[PDB]
């Protein structure tokens, strides 16, 4: 949707590949991409590098009274789309160990 044309979105790639993409870009703190979840069809994964380890955060869709939102914490922090989610965590950590600092591009 609003995320197809974003440099940090990589669609359907695997966990092993998102790691290899971030690795081939230096394992810098703050490197990230968002991908379609492999296990979960309607879900997404935020893959992020911190302290030279790649971490993976499940993004799940839900509904409040007919309105779709996404969340990484069981609805405790809700976002209308992935861009809102990504933009927020460029400024605020929330449940993440560090900010989304450098977009891992493709």
């Amino acid at each position: 949707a609003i995320h197809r044309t974003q440099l940090w979105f990589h669609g359907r790639i695997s966990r092993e590949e998102s790691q290899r993409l971030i690795g081939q870009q230096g394992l810098v703190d703050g490197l990230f991409l968002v991908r379609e979840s492999q296990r979960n069809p309607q879900g997404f994964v935020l893959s992020l590098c911190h302290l030279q380890k790649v971490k993976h955060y499940l993004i799940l869709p839900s509904e409040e009274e007919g309105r779709l939102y996404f969340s990484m914490d069981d609805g405790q922090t809700r976002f209308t789309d992935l861009l809102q989610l990504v933009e927020f965590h460029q400024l605020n950590r929330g449940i993440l160990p560090c900010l989304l600092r450098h977009c891992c591009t493709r």
Binding site: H56, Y57, L58, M72, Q76, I95
Partner: peptide, 10 residues
């Protein structure tokens, strides 16, 4: 949490 995943929250 989500098994398989790093989400850490109350």
């Amino acid at each position: 949490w989500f098994e398989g995943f790093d989400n850490t929250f109350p």
